[PDB]
Amino acid sequence: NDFHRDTWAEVDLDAIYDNVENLRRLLPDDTHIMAVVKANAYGHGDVQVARTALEAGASRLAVAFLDEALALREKGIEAPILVLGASRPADAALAAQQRIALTVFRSDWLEEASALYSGPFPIHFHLKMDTGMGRLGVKDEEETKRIVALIERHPHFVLEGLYTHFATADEVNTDYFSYQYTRFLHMLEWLPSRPPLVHCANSAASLRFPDRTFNMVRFGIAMYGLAPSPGIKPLLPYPLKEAFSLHSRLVHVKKLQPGEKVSFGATYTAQTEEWIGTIPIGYADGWLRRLQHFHVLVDGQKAPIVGRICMDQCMIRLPGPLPVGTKVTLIGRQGDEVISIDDVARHLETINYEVPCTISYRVPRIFFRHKRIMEVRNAI
Amino acid sequence: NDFHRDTWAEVDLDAIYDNVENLRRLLPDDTHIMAVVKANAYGHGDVQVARTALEAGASRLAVAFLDEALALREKGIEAPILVLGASRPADAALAAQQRIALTVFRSDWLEEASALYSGPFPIHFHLKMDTGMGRLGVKDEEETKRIVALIERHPHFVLEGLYTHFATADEVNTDYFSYQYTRFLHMLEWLPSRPPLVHCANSAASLRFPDRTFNMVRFGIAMYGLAPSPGIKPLLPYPLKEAFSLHSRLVHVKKLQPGEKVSFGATYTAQTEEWIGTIPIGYADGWLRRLQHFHVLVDGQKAPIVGRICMDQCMIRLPGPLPVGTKVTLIGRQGDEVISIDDVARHLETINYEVPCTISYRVPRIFFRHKRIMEVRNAIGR
Ligand SMILES: Cc1ncc(COP(=O)(O)O)c(CNc2conc2O)c1O
Ligand SMILES: Cc1ncc(COP(=O)(O)O)c(CNc2conc2O)c1O
């Protein structure tokens, strides 16, 4: 995959491999690892992250919705996949034909599905229980039993597992968390039989209490080397390795005279003669306008962004007359300077999770494995 | 093309067509229209909008960088395409064989290109002049004349046009706009001869001053039916037709008891008995966390978002019990209620341009033409 604009993201698969390996070491032998690769693996590349996680010790994969599971299958991934979110009862046959497990939490879903499907492939279901997140999941014992009854009755429906999700596993105070964990145990008792796969921990929960992860953990944010939250960082059992970095190059360089304005709205005025560099990245690439007033790295030095950020372009104040082609790092390291995704999330007034997901389809991803470029992916 | 999540965007190509067709009649008959379709047509679908615009009167297309132009050609587009942004002189040949025009703003670029290219396909260039935007473009007479001469010299280089871009055309006050217009006229005199295509007008400039557009306009934002700025809405010569809308469906419905928490951080807590719906759209789809105090349309009414927006979903307070599958409109109209891209932009404290561009690859685009679904585009579909 080649691309023709000097803007790209770099995904170090070694960082992903290591984050997964360290979790494997930490976790009891009986706890499996399910790599969470939804949203194109949090913007890092679904297949690339998936195959690497499987190498490091993960045996299963998780995605947000059916299409994401189908995209993995089409790309050659044959490992087990679980859709964490909702799906259509009408798509049960497709999921089954494609060996994709589905999350379920309503009895009417199963009834609708039973009327529309009768074989020949079995469908593996993971019952979602709401223990406090208030997102998806069954909440009454009567419903739980009805759902189980419908699955056991259908000759092609299988209850592979059951789970819940924690809403505050990344907060120092563990009051609500403990509440959710306790409620989960009580609800499990509603099941006539304990499914082979019981899981509940995400990155925060698994890393903090690896001994209360039952038989499978759903490793997400930490696999990409990003902390679940600022407050949990000083609690992480091992150093996370950031895998995502973002770069570009100066495509234009010019010296402005005092009084000259830059970008839309002419919001910036050069107070003194200075050199301005233009880079080929804008908000259509996920470098949102809110990043105005932020600093990028060039020649190992911080260079503030000047004026408003454009759809495809960006202007910065250079320390001096630098040549076109000079490497600009928006996320990553240059010399003794470093910009993390947390720094970017901070300025964007959001959390690390959102940043890589927002770097759009337009930005090619270059993959590094064993310190060598292994593959390049340009969505267009 | 199919998709398997109840979340999608609809692009009304009839609206696209009408916005461009109206511009066709507003402008002088000899003025060409270049449809700007960079960023996958501002998130509406590059080839679908490009093809539609050409039917409506547009004769040329514009993109941000080379990859977007090659994409259009791969998709069957044959009309002229100009790359507005920078490019690698090493890629000159490829662009030439693909009949893609390139923007140029410095002589050393031509030096490098000339050293690596010697035919057979001609490369058409559009010289960029910076008239106050401070992005790209030459700024002195010397450099200008040098670019022209280097183009003249090379047997396969051709100066097709010259242009500039306005930084404040969508502002009521026209002081800076006037300065830029006047500077552009001054800079045009630096050229030994006028290239066939002189241009400067974007949506705002073209719509407000159609008789000040030279021989070609670059129609962007208004083609999608979006006002260049809320400020000039009353100055619009003709009503724009909003092309983009975003929808979803409830995938779960439940009645919470007072005291129960919702979403990450246990941020929200129900005070009394209420109904909560869950929809399959989150920030990985472009529905940013920043929208947590915003709302959506359901059952023909405004339904506030509750708690924090997750990566793939969010919760909303329902007016009461509703069936799973009930349609939810994030951007569009339901009965006598409506949420526009401008509404989303205002809440997010950003401009309308950014909103559709942010609705990610993950969201399928359903295309309508002549009031019927024409095609579906699912970026991750089989
Ligand atoms: C059901 C489920 N399990 C595990 C994970 C992994 O969580 P982690 O990246 O903190 O390790 C997620 C993603 N959780 C989400 C984070 O933001 N929105 C989400 O849905 C999830 O939805
Ligand atoms: C050179 C050029 N011409 C024409 C247009 C169309 O502008 P319009 O959508 O206001 O009609 C743009 C896009 N203008 C941009 C808007 O944000 N960043 C941009 O580069 C552009 O960059």
From Swiss-Prot, chain A:
Regulation of catalytic or functional activity: Inhibited by acetate and propionate. Irreversibly inhibited by cycloserine.
Superkingdom field: Bacteria
GO-annotated molecular function: alanine racemase activity; pyridoxal phosphate binding
Catalytic residues (positions): K38 (proton acceptor), F264 (proton acceptor)
Residues that coordinate or bind substrate: R135, M311
GO biological process, one term: peptidoglycan biosynthetic process
Enzyme class: isomerase
One Pfam match: Ala_racemase_C
Coiled-coil ranges (or none): none
GO-annotated cellular components: cytosol
Catalytic activity: L-alanine = D-alanine
Quaternary structure annotation from Swiss-Prot or TrEMBL: Homodimer.
Membership in a protein family: Belongs to the alanine racemase family.
Function: Catalyzes the interconversion of L-alanine and D-alanine. Also weakly active on serine.
Protein name: Alanine racemase
